Amino acid sequence: MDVLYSLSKTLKDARDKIVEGTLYSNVSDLIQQFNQMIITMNGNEFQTGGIGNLPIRNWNFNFGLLGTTLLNLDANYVETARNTIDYFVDFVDNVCMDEMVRESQRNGIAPQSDSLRKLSAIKFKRINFDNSS
Amino acid sequence: MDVLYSLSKTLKDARDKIVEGTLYSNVSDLIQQFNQMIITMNGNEFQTGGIGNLPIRNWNFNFGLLGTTLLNLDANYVETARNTIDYFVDFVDNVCMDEMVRESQRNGIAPQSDSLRKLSAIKFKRINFDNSS
Amino acid sequence: MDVLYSLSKTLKDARDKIVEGTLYSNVSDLIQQFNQMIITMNGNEFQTGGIGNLPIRNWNFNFGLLGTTLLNLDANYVETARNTIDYFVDFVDNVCMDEMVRESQRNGIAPQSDSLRKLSAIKFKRINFDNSS
Amino acid sequence: KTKEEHQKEVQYEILQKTIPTFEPKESILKKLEDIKPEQAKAQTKLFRIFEPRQKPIYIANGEKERRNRIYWKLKKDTLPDGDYDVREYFLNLYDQVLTEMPDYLLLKDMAVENKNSRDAGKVVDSETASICDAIFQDEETEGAVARFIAEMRQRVQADRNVVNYPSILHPIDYAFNEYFLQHQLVEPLNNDIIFNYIPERIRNDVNYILNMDRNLPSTARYIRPNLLQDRLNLHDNFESLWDTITTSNYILARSVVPDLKELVSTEAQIQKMSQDLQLEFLTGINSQAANDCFKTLIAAMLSQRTMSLDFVTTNYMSLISGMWLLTVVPNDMFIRESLVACQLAIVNTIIYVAFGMQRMHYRNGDPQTPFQIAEQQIQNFQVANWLHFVNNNYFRQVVIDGVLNQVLNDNIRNGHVINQLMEALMQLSRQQFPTMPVDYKRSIQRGILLLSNRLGQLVDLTRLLAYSYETLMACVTMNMQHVQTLTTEKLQLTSVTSLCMLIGNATVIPSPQTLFHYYNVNVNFHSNYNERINDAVAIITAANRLNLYQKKMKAIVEDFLKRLHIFDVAVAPDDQMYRLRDRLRLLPVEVRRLDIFNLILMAMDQIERASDKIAQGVIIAYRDMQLERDEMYGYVNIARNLDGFQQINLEELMRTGSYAQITNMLLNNQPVALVGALPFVTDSSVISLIAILDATVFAQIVKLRKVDTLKPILYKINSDSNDFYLVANYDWVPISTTKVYKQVPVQFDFRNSMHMLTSNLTFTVYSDLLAFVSADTVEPINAVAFDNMRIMNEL
Amino acid sequence: IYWKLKKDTLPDGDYDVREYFLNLYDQVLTEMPDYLLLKDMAVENKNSRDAGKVVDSETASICDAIFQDEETEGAVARFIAEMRQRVQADRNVVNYPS
């Protein structure tokens, strides 16, 4: 649960702050969190869908790392970030829209969807950035 | 007066951004702020209440320094932080509760509680992390 | 357009988080951003107004550089920061007032005021910051 | 007495064996003055970790393809067994790259001539030229690559001082070099910058004149010396280290105190004092002693030492001079023993003797000094007022330009308290002095008259001392706290009397060159201290984040202390070392070193995967598996994942010593997956694979209860194996059990390895920053003070 | 491994037993420690995978003997390897294993 919100917050801050012409010493923490997330999620398989009309999609994290050595972000780095950001936002939208419409008559507070069940393991708990909402 | 708001912001940040899984690089500044606050506030004793049915309670401050070594926060760090977080939350809650009801005809701006009187002294001015609301 | 928002956000962050007592770690990004903005905006002039009864005013930027190495900011740092913070606030107010009253039939998205036309140059794009708004 | 002196020497030696200072107190001066500034170190050759090699590929069926594909490899392959040793080597490389950190790059000189391009252009580095020649001669590349290699051009925009060169490197190396390029430590040097770098108090003076004569080139590049304040709070719980530091500062300050000139004749003054004192003691009065005492006093007031008072009470003139000493120097600069002893002696030998009051019964250790009791017991206005002034004379806490300093009060600074002292002494001179013998009283009052009869010279001496203190303290960079310390400096009371009774009319101000020498030495020491602190904290923080728990922090703290050039490690106490370590653990590291560590930790996975002498782990799986084919090698046990098998860390089991789990999982035949930095034996023998061998390389694990010797096997079946004809001529599925957790080395891609560097055209490194300023002193006679009055007003 | 007396000079006879006890008490009181340092008596353990230090050389020998005995289980070995001194210099207190 909290892992999904941490990923969403990371993506939102990446959308807000990764623009051409900024200073790296202002978004260093966000870039570090993004790199840690992409290291953790790399090499996994996911399945989403099953009911209603939501399509059955397979998701694989296979994106390369992001450099942090440039003092000013340029257009190349901007588009490199943006492509993966759009992919991640589509993935999180899909998993959220899957989880929203499912419920149970007992133990409703617990996750029910396959993706949320899988993302509740022990290792994935090493990605939790902020809970500010 | 602003010291109370800084304390509240520090407590909220410590409770929300300090959980298991967060890389230390995300909250290094918060760690430094918390260490400074706990060092400065240590050793000074406060009292609250003294009017109406509001209970009269004492206060003490003897707490260790939050660590800065582990790459990623662990559960022991979480418990160590959260114990002091709980105590300080109780302290600030009682302080504001006492400061609300008391009032004066003259010098309405002037704080009326001894807690605030000692808070705005010449030694506690080292904790003003934020004024943004 | 985005440069004006960056200026406003930087001014807000500076006038909020620069208060005597806070540790220097809390303003590292603020210090870097403010220093780059000051060193980039200097050696320049602007003219605003020229329509209606708004104050037709000329502005010159030749301010100095803030200190960098300080364990804890004293009141001198806050005063020398505010002495330019107020000037920047007045400049942003003048620019926004001159921008709001203007209008055009064609290409309303693009900037119209001469000050905004000049500020849209790439050389000022280094003042870009986060877009959390 | 000799036995008593031996016992006291034994006790003081036991005390001294807890202080890091060498036996003679003069070698510290040499070590300090020999401290070179922060060395400017350029990079003669580019910092490269990855270089390309040529390797043959194989058809999927297991025969050579005749193509020669370019791969990547480490320059050095020295990654040993065990994850802990790998991370220790990583920390060593971190230290190496931290020491090798450059400050400025002249990329024009590093460029070399190129032959590949038909335009006779330039290339960045010799290694880039060699790899470009390698890719140019070979015909297994695209034509667009040839077009780019022929059209790649350098550009020099000298007006804005920007130059670019094309380079071919791996992303890690290019990221390193670009971060070094964009994060340069050098800043432009303007006339205003060099003018405001000079301390402002000296600039505001009128005794000195600062004239700018040398012409700064428009391409001025200088490194700003680090001026960060102390981050250790060396004023509490650090008595030994603080004592060593302040003793070194005392020696350095003593080294720069100007000497006195043409004092009044000593023999005549001795004769006059002997005649006036009516002697039936006064020995040890020489100009050398006076100069040494003056230098000791000014240096002690400067470097915030603690001064012990030594006297022989039989010489009342010693206490008379000590009256002036106590008036001038604030009482908080001494240790309590000396202050209480001197106060009790002075009060019970001069004043209370003269005023017909009982001798002051007193108890040591009262919260109030005896002078306060004197103040609230005597109603003679002159001496009472003087006693009050001395009572509340303390160092004043001020902050100038963000630098903490302790300065004297204004009243003594202009030389006015000497008039009060003279008036009080003259009041005591004609006093009745009851219940005292004849000759003793006569001698006392005549000595008092002798000290009173030097009013103008005493005023000049004290205000000259004040001005010298101001001038010397102006250039102090590090702040000075105020706290009592273990050791002290012996102040000779007889020397104080000599200075009081022998001061002439010679104005002596510090020489400008001496002032600049002291300032440069102090700032060099401060920069070295700050940089060593930064390196130590970065080392400890990086080691802690990367999980290196055996790194004894005591060794790192030992190296840090030893590299301060003013200490001695073999004497330090362990508890204070642990306190210093705990202080260091909580400081935030500077951003450059933290970012370097972040880059290292983001590239460590790739670096470890790149080596061919190391592997991530092994899977046995206790089941038959079809061999996976690869382009790099004919038939390999490639397992790019550890899916479906339980993971156990070898180093964890080894250090913990719990061997039960792996022993059971090996004996009872259950699939497992060991993970750890393990070298592997390449097996180019298909017959060795047929006769199953990767099933007994784990027996020694339980045979000897050790894991370092564990040397797994990886099968490499190719055409050149001396037995490959079995696979080609017989039909059998390649069957094996043991796989190795390894990723294929990255294919050499040219369109992403190519990169362009950004740097300045050319410049010069400036560090001295003092050869561009001249300071000629005014004539020594006409020197004035803050109030625009002359320094010495007696002529 | 069990417990045995380091010294076995006790003579027979209950009276001689009491005499030996009196001599032991006298030796203990004569060898009384006035100030007890704990940093001096420290030999680094070769088997502590956290690079700890122990109280006595014989303690190190015992730790090495237990750590290296093929007839012993792994839990005790891991407990041996987990030994490490923790120093808290802010309150002037240290802890050692024995």
Percent of residues in beta strands of chain A: 5-15%
Query: What is the SS-derived class of chain D?
Result: alpha+beta
What is the succession of H and E elements of chain A?
A: HHEEHH
Number of helices of chain D: 31
Query: How much helical structure, as a percent, in the residues of chain A?
Result: 40-55%
PDB class: viral protein
Keywords: Rotavirus, STA, viral protein
Entry title: Subtomogram average of Immature Rotavirus TLP penton
Chains A, B, C: Intermediate capsid protein VP6
Polypeptide structure, described:
This is part of a larger assembly, with 3 copies of chain A (133 residues) and 2 copies of chain D. Chain A has 4 helices and 2 strands. With 133 residues, chain A is mainly alpha-helical. Chain D is built from 31 helices and 26 strands. The longest helix of chain D is centred in the middle third of the chain and has 34 residues, at 512-545. The D-E interface holds D 549-550, 552, 574-575, 578-579, 582, 654-660, 705 and E 39, 47, 49-51, 67, 70, 73-75, 77-78, 80-82, 87, 89-90, 92.
Give the gist of this structure.
Chain A is mainly alpha-helical and 133 residues long. Chain A has 4 helices and 2 strands, in the order H-H-E-E-H-H. The PDB classes it as viral protein.
Question: What does the secondary structure layout of this molecule look like, with pairings?
Answer:
This is part of a larger assembly, with 3 copies of chain A (133 residues) and 2 copies of chain D.
Chain A: H1 2-17, H2 28-41, E1 45-48, E2 57-60, H3 75-100, H4 114-118
Antiparallel strand pairs in A: 1-2
Helix pairs in contact in A: 1-2, 1-3
Chain D: H1 2-16, H2 27-33, E1 50-58, E2 64-74, H3 83-99, H4 107-110, E3 112-113, E4 122-123, H5 126-137, H6 143-151, E5 155-157, E6 162-168, H7 171-182, E7 186-188, H8 191-197, H9 200-204, E8 208-212, E9 220-223, H10 239-254, H11 266-277, H12 287-303, E10 307-310, H13 316-328, H14 336-354, H15 370-375, H16 381-391, E11 396-400, E12 403-407, H17 410-413, H18 417-429, H19 438-452, H20 455-474, E13 489-492, H21 493-502, H22 512-545, H23 553-562, H24 574-585, H25 591-610, E14 617-619, E15 625-626, E16 628-629, E17 635-636, E18 647-649, H26 650-656, H27 660-667, E19 673-675, E20 681-683, H28 686-690, H29 699-704, E21 713-715, H30 725-729, E22 735-736, E23 739-740, H31 750-753, E24 754-759, E25 764-766, E26 773-777
Parallel strand pairs in D: 9-25, 10-13, 18-19, 20-21
Antiparallel strand pairs in D: 1-2, 3-4, 5-6, 6-24, 7-9, 8-26, 11-12, 14-19, 14-23, 15-22, 16-17
Helix pairs in contact in D: 3-22, 3-25, 10-12, 12-21, 13-14, 13-19, 13-21, 18-19, 18-20, 22-23
Subcellular location (chain D): Virion
GO molecular function, one term (chain D): RNA binding
Family (chain D): Belongs to the rotavirus VP2 family.
